[PDB]
Design a binder for this molecule. Structure first.
Ligand SMILES: Nc1ncnc2c1ncn2[C@@H]1O[C@H](CSCC[C@H](N)C(=O)O)[C@@H](O)[C@H]1O
Ligand code: NA
Lengths: 265, 265
């Protein structure tokens, strides 16, 4: 009678850890949500087949409003698993769900899995150099979010890299592309004119991290804003001041313009 | 003709992903390094048994100086795997190893695994709020490094959390405890007197992330500086101002004092 928060990883069903696999296999009931992120290389059936269990998929409302009515009750009798893409407690509000479990007298355990937060290392940018992170959100009616623009500015002034998660509207099967994120950022620049994100800004796009052949591209906005980076999900990164080895990697591995090799220390 | 950079995960032999396990199992040669970190919850023998392959351990010099002479030659006519604790490419100098592979006409692929960079999410602290990261190094001889202190200052100053890696002597299997890290910081505070780290500073300690029973403790330095967090490795986090939900989690899950619900929010 316990609850397991189990991460499924970045791209397909094999991104789950062996630990999560073996534990998930032995749970009595298995729940999951697929709205916090997109696992582009697998399907529910493949995940179900891998753990040999039928998976009840929950919506954001089920989780956020009814977690303790749908999931917790069964944990007070059986071993329950709650699966999520990536790492269960990263860039989500899932940690709070552990507080709910505790208050219901249910013990919970966390099984981590690869997360985009660390997978950014494949871009060649030193992970310790990443500053505050943010999310580029889709404008809604008259509401046009812009906070993420200030995050980039703050990090950039400190010479730190900025990780930008991209919006997702799972119910409409909408996944923001790096292209759309760049368009939105240029518009915010026009509005704020802080010289933070322009046609000459160097950016890095990582698409489908976790797959064997993710798309890793670096370059100036003017050249990438209309480039095809393949299917979602995508994440956008605005590097801060680069170390020489970072620039070298971006050029040799991400096909960046050879001119960025010339860092202005 | 292929080199696989494969992450071993956080704590034990089951922390590798299903993808990493299956791929490594099929490789003709399997290399590993345990100088950037150790897998405290397992042994080389247990990792070898799970992978079903004998593993050749490489020292720091073997990798940084002779990667192209030890690993790459074999990857030209065989499938070779290179295992590292955590997520591959997280360690600062590892990304450059892919450039070496390209230079030798070797294709390389990255198989991710959980990293402490994302696993710290189990502390209840929002991942987007983490700023620049740093490592606490022991002073020695006429050298007393203090940069990690400036990192805390710059982060907290902007309401950001600071992830602190603690000094490790992998070869000698010697670890810096969170207790020791706190003492150094207090000693650095006495010299710089910037009001950054004191007896009243709230900190979070994470030990054995990845195991099913990690140690997660939060509290003021005056109360935790002599507490026993168990066996290494320990990770120290100096949070910035907390969101009320972060504080509630630290109180309910990490045993933090109720006091933080009003003092650090
Ligand atoms: N495999 C992947 N490749 C690129 N971006 C990814 C990704 N997985 C997640 N993301 C990014 O992160 C957003 C989800 S945020 C939730 C992240 C998740 N808990 C984790 O640990 O990864 C997506 O909209 C996307 O922008
Ligand atoms: Na970070």
């Amino acid at each position: 009678m316990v609850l397991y928060f189990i991460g499924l990883g970045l791209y397909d069903e094999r991104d789950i850890t062996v630990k999560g696999h073996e534990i998930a296999k032995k749970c009595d009931y298995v729940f999951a949500e697929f709205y916090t992120s997109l696992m582009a290389g697998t399907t529910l059936g493949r995940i179900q087949k891998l753990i040999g269990k039928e998976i009840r998929v929950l919506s954001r409302e089920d989780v956020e409003l009814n977690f303790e009515n749908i999931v917790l009750p069964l944990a007070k009798e059986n071993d329950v698993a709650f699966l999520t893409p990536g790492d269960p407690l990263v860039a989500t509000t899932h940690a709070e769900l552990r507080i709910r479990a505790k208050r219901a007298g249910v013990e919970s355990y966390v099984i981590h899995a690869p997360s985009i937060y660390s997978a950014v290392g494949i871009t060649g940018l030193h992970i310790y150099k990443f500053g505050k992170s943010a999310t580029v959100a889709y404008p809604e009616g008259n509401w046009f979010p812009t906070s993420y623009y200030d995050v980039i500015k703050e990090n950039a002034e400190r010479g730190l890299h900025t990780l930008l998660f991209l919006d997702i509207k799972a119910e409409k099967r909408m996944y923001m592309t790096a292209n759309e994120a760049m368009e939105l950022l240029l518009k915010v620049e026009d509005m704020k004119k802080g010289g933070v994100f322009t046609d000459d800004t160097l950016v890095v796009v990582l698409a489908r991290a976790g797959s064997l052949n993710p798309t890793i591209r670096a370059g100036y906005v003017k050249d990438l804003i209309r480039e095809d980076f393949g299917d979602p999900p995508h994440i956008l990164i605005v590097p801060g001041k680069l170390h020489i080895v970072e620039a070298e990697y971006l050029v040799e591995i991400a096909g960046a313009p050879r001119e960025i090799l010339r860092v202005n220390v």
